[PDB]
């Protein structure tokens, strides 16, 4: 279940990197 | 890149004797159709 | 003069009924004539890449080209249907008579 | 093996035997779907 | 004063209760 | 009832007296009837009934007078489409006197189920009015009217204003639903109202501003923009907005 | 507004009722290599040149807007053609 | 066969008795060996319209192939009607669901007001328009279908406030021809059939 | 019970409504439904018609009666 | 006998049609001999024997073998549809063609299904005659009785629909061709004269 | 990078490496709908033009060309009918004025 | 009415085709009126 | 002509017409 939850977070991260979503400077 | 929704088409296909695209510019598209086409070779 | 007004009213009806009947079919025919020539044009570029690219570039270009065919599959649609159930069904009907007023007298004697 | 040589193409679900072309319209459970 | 969650908003239009003014917001972003 | 000669006063008012009033009107007399109201007092004083627009179209050679009557027949067809939509929506709820289509629809209980402000049939008013469902949906529509109702903070409106503008934009606009209206509803309703068959009526061969003033007088509503204002705008799906109305 | 960031629509009828415009454009970045590659083979096809190679891209339209345009094109019973114009 | 209408129960009858097998033998007899009645054509049409399978009707039509050398008008006209009724039942379902969710929002305003005032106080074919279709009937109401379906996409995320092609990020892939209507491209399917398992 | 601003402009709407109603038009008017058994049915043609009596509800010239 | 009838019911539902027709025939014979002819037990068994004679004679005409289950053999893919799987849908969009007529002439001229259709016709006519004869007279005994009439007329409508399905599906191809051409001259007459339109739609008065 | 392409997915027309199938694109639950081969075999099918995409190309040749034949006959029948009714006009002009 | 492909039908079809001097005329129906 | 595709093979001699391979089944005299 932790691996399943960690993919849900990590994929959501990758989707935000495709948009570009620059980190808080 | 202009992704264009090409609707119903009419081959205007300017007859030999044309000096340019003046027929392909100023003609009104008929209400049946929504697009025009021209083979430029 | 009232001859040619009735006869051109039938001509205007003929040209308007043919315009939207042939309009559904000619739009589909030019749609598929563009469809043949676009994909035949796409094969001409792949034949050029066959003779110009080294084997490494041509394999990548072939993977590119298969997706190019399938994207042209998606961006073509499939309406069919309405451009197939339109038929050559046009016919002329009418009753036009030149009648004298006393002929109209005899027509009303037979009729109501 | 009861009609020679026409190759099976689908399966019958209620009875565990596959279905050929000739017997599809008159199978055991020919008529969610079987 | 156009900020906040879009369910409630406040009635500014002449008869539109306020939750259709998200149906006119084109997504401006950069 | 026509006795024996009332079919002759009918048989001359459609064949010879009609063709005489047309014959005066194609010669272009000084100050030919300009708007719709001078045109109607022209035919009325000559004795020809106005509901013979189909015969007056078929008897004319001049391409001018073909267009003048094409303004008139469309103007009165959109007048009646305006009228019967308003009637079929007011007298439709449940009670006392209501339209024939409202009584006939016993269905719609097969779709909505009881698990309230909804009076059930209130959700699908698109079927009570006397039009096909594809035409009817844009007749009762509000999505292209958000921006204007946002901006007006003083002037109230009515739903009668909305169904008005749905009808005006489906006849005058560069909308594809406007092309649908002229091809399946406005053309067929002209054929069964003024005997003008659907082939002759086309959206291209009609003048956009003169048809608009013809609806200004027949439909009984006056707008702030004039005929020249519509010509000097970019084409649009719903070019006429609620703020374009006055009273 | 806290209404996400450009992932829903434009409402072509509802947002520009008096104006006939496609949509307002976005910026984004194309750094996905497979999308960058498929755009390169598009321009290679249009120019008969096995020398052209892409350097970058910018999708000035949301993917939800691309889907809305695709459904409107099929509603018009017509296909979609890519036009490669110079700026 | 049961309800029918008047005049010797509509399909023409005879001498009392006359079991329906030999009665139908009479009915095919009048049509071929012609001494029939005007309602006798409505017999064999109304019986054929409800009793044959669609294949059996297609063989019956195909006996006419001298005239109409063309084929497959039946699947084409069935696919237009199947598209029209499927488009119709979805568009009404989206239209009703848009109108419940929007009036649910007005009730949502009303409930937060009544707690706010309280708190301050406490302080089979059926041809309709699919035939001869050139007036572009599709554009009017498929436009409404696209607008209303994604209208529910807006409305759903108003309730929650209260990835089908490019799945390689998940690890699945980017199957060619994976547009929303279809599930497998033409070249991708035919690779699954012969060139692999 | 809808917003306060639109309550006060609806109140403003009914406020401006009698201003249009009076002065040049008569200063509001009372209506009689006049049911469909009256001997005014000779003035009626169709069986679904609705007749309405109109009294001026003003100083008038004591004529009224439309 | 009731065991033998329901065993034929289970055998027809599972699918084996010949041995269920034989088993229901023996049950029908013994139940007819002992316990009359107007019993609903006898009527249900004889309707059952007729029903399998319908099913063994019409499964091939309603559903011919054909060459389906192969994309380019049922359109579908030609119209953009991405397969259907279900045979009830593959039959629906199958186009008829010049090559299917080997199977069409096979099925219509198959003797085993033809004389089972004829034996079906005999058994549904006896079913219809017995239901009509038993419905002419009531039963008078010393008890309160219900309608007992809605089941009698339901078996009459069952013995009318099922008779016409068998008798019409059992039509010779020259007869069906003549009927189809008669409907053609009815159809082509509609764009004609007033006398031709009425006379092709029968109207044999003048 | 620095792993070479040994596999080409045929249902996706994409090039993968062994690290690119474990970490990259074709990494989740897959296979039996994602066929992969060696790239030597894939190169053989381009030259011998017998790939599934090359003979799905040929299926699309037949489908569109057959529809062109039917549409060309439909232009011919509509044009024939238009000047059929036009001939009825010309005969009506010669008859009514006659 | 004369039946399809009967003896009288072939006589009417051949007599029609011979008078019109073509093979493209075909009899649709041959109703008896006598 | 009553079905396309395949050619005639035999002869009928009662009603004089060409017979194909599928035609003798609807021929009542099927021999001559």
TrEMBL record, chain A:
Its lineage reads:
Eukaryota, Sar, Alveolata, Apicomplexa, Conoidasida
Its source organism is Toxoplasma gondii (strain ATCC 50611 / Me49)
Name assigned to this protein: CLU central domain-containing protein
TrEMBL record, chain B:
Q: In terms of domain of life, where is this protein from?
A: Eukaryota
Protein name according to UniProt: B-box zinc finger domain-containing protein
Q: Which organism is it from?
A: Toxoplasma gondii (strain ATCC 50611 / Me49)
The major lineage groups are: Eukaryota, Sar, Alveolata, Apicomplexa, Conoidasida
Q: Which residues of the full protein are shown?
A: 148 to 188 of 1073
From TrEMBL, chain D:
Q: Which residues form the B box-type domain?
A: 1-29
- The identity of this protein, by name, is Zinc finger protein
Which part of the full protein is shown? 353 to 402 of 603
TrEMBL record, chain J:
Domain of life from the UniProt record: Eukaryota
Q: Would you tell me the protein name for this molecule?
A: Clu domain-containing protein
Q: Which residues of the full protein are shown?
A: 4338 to 4543 of 4956
């Amino acid at each position: 279940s932790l691996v399943s939850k960690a993919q849900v977070a990590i994929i959501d991260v990758r989707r935000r990197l495709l948009r570009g979503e620059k980190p808080k400077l | 890149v202009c992704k264009l929704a090409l609707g119903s088409v009419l081959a205007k296909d300017s007859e030999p004797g044309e000096t340019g695209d003046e027929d392909f510019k100023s003609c009104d598209i008929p209400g049946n159709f929504t697009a025009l086409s021209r083979r430029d070779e | 003069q009232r001859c040619y007004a009735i006869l051109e009213e039938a001509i205007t009806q003929l040209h308007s009924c043919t315009e939207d009947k042939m309009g559904a079919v000619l739009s589909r025919q030019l749609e598929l004539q563009r469809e043949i020539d676009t994909m035949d044009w796409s094969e001409s570029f792949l034949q050029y890449l066959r003779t110009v690219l080294p084997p490494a570039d041509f394999l990548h270009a072939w993977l590119r080209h298969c997706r190019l065919r399938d994207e042209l599959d998606a961006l073509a649609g499939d309406p069919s249907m309405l451009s197939r159930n339109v038929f050559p069904d046009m016919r002329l009907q009418g009753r036009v008579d030149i009648l004298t007023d006393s002929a109209l007298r005899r027509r009303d004697y037979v009729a109501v | 093996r009861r009609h020679p040589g026409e190759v099976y193409e689908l399966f019958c679900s209620i009875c565990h035997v596959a279905v050929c072309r000739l017997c599809r319209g008159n199978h055991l459970h020919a008529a969610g779907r079987s | 004063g156009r900020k906040g969650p879009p369910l409630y908003w406040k009635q500014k239009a002449v008869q539109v209760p306020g939750f259709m003014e998200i149906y006119t917001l084109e997504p401006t972003t950069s | 009832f026509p006795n024996s000669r009332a079919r002759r006063l009918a048989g001359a008012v459609r064949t010879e007296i009609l063709n005489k009033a047309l014959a005066e009107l194609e010669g272009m007399p000084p100050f030919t009837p300009m708007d719709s109201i001078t045109l109607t007092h022209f035919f009325h004083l000559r004795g020809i009934n106005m509901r013979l627009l189909g015969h007056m179209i078929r008897g004319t050679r001049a391409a001018w007078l073909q267009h003048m009557l094409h303004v008139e027949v469309v103007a009165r067809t959109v007048k009646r489409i305006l009228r019967d939509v308003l009637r079929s929506l007011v007298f439709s709820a449940h009670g006392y006197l209501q339209t024939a289509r409202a009584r006939m629809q016993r269905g719609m209980k097969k779709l909505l189920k009881r698990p309230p402000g909804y009076s059930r049939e209130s959700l699908l008013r698109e079927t009570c009015l006397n039009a096909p469902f594809d035409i009817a949906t844009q007749l009762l529509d509000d999505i292209p009217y958000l921006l204007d109702l946002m901006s007006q903070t003083f002037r109230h409106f009515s739903w009668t204003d909305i169904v008005l503008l749905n009808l005006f934009n489906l006849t005058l606009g560069d909308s594809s639903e406007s092309d649908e209206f002229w091809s399946s509803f406005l053309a067929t309703r002209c054929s069964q109202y003024f005997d003008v068959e659907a082939g002759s009526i086309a959206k291209s061969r009609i003048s956009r501003p003169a048809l608009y003033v013809a609806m200004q007088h027949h439909c009984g509503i006056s707008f702030l923009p004039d005929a020249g204002a519509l010509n000097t705008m970019r084409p649009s799906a719903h070019p006429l907005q609620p703020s374009h109305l006055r009273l | 507004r806290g209404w996400t960031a450009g992932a829903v629509s434009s409402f072509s009828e509802a947002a520009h009722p008096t104006e006939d415009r496609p949509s307002l454009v976005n910026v984004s970045v194309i750094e996905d290599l497979q999308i960058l590659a498929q755009w390169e083979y598009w321009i290679q096809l249009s120019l008969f040149t096995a020398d052209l190679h892409i350097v970058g891209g910018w999708n000035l339209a949301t993917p939800a807007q691309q889907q809305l345009f695709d459904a409107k094109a099929s509603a018009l019973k017509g296909p979609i053609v890519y036009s490669f114009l110079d700026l | 066969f049961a309800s029918m209408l008047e005049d010797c129960i509509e399909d023409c009858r005879q001498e009392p008795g006359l079991v329906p097998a030999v009665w139908f033998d009479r009915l095919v007899g009048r049509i071929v060996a012609e001494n029939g009645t005007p309602n006798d054509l409505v017999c064999f049409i109304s019986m054929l319209r409800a009793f044959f399978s669609p294949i059996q009707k297609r063989i019956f039509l195909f006996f006419l192939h001298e005239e109409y050398a063309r084929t497959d008008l039946d699947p084409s006209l069935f696919h237009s009607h199947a598209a029209r009724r499927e488009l119709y039942i979805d568009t009404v379902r989206k239209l009703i669901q848009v109108r419940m969710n929007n009036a649910r929002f007005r009730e949502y305003q009303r409930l937060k007001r009544l707690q706010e005032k309280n708190k301050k106080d406490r302080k089979y074919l059926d041809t309709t328009g699919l035939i001869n279709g050139c007036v572009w009937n599709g554009i009017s109401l498929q436009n409404l279908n696209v607008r209303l379906s994604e209208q529910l996409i807006y409305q759903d995320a108003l309730e929650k406030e209260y990835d089908h092609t490019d799945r390689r990020l998940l690890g699945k892939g980017w199957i060619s021809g994976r547009t929303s209507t279809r599930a497998m491209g033409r070249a991708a399917e035919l690779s699954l059939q012969k060139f692999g398992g | 019970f809808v917003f306060d601003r639109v309550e006060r402009k609806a109140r403003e709407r009914r406020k401006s409504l009698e201003v249009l109603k009076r002065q040049w038009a008569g200063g509001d008017l009372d209506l009689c439904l006049l049911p469909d058994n009256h001997p005014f049915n000779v003035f009626r043609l169709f069986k679904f018609d609705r007749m309405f009596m109109a009294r001026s509800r003003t100083e008038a010239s004591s004529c009224g009666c439309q | 006998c009731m065991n033998r009838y329901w065993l034929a019911v289970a055998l027809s539902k599972v699918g084996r049609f010949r041995d269920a027709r034989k088993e229901a025939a023996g049950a029908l014979v013994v139940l007819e001999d002992r316990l009359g002819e107007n019993h609903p037990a006898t009527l249900s068994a004889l309707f059952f024997v007729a029903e399998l004679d319908q099913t063994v004679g019409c499964e091939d005409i309603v559903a011919p073998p054909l060459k389906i289950m192969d994309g380019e053999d049922t359109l579908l893919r030609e119209f953009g549809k991405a397969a259907s799987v279900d045979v009830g849908e593959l039959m629906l969009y199958r186009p008829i063609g010049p090559e299917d007529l080997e199977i069409v002439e096979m099925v219509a001229r198959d003797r085993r299904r033809g004389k089972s259709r004829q034996s079906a016709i005999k058994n549904f006519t006896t079913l219809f005659r017995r239901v009509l004869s038993g419905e002419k007279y009531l039963l008078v005994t010393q008890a309160q009785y219900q309608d007992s009439r809605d089941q009698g007329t339901r078996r009459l409508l069952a013995a009318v629909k099922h008779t016409l399905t068998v008798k019409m599906c059992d039509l010779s191809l020259p007869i069906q061709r003549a009927v189809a051409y008669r409907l053609y001259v009815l159809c082509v007459s509609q764009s004609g004269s007033s006398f031709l339109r009425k006379l092709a739609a029968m109207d044999r008065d003048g | 990078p620095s792993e070479m392409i040994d596999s080409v997915c045929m249902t996706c027309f994409v090039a993968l490496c062994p690290h690119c199938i474990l970490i990259g694109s074709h990494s989740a639950a897959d296979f039996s709908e994602h066929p992969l081969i060696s790239t030597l075999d894939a190169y053989k099918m381009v030259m011998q033009d017998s790939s599934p995409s090359e003979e799905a190309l040929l299926e699309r040749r037949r489908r569109i060309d057959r529809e062109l034949v039917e549409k060309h006959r439909q232009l011919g029948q509509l044009h024939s009918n238009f000047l059929s009714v036009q001939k009825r006009i010309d005969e009506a002009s010669k008859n009514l004025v006659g | 009415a004369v039946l399809r492909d009967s003896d009288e039908w072939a006589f009417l079809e051949y007599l029609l085709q011979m008078s019109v001097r073509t093979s493209r005329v075909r009899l649709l129906q041959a109703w008896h009126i006598a």
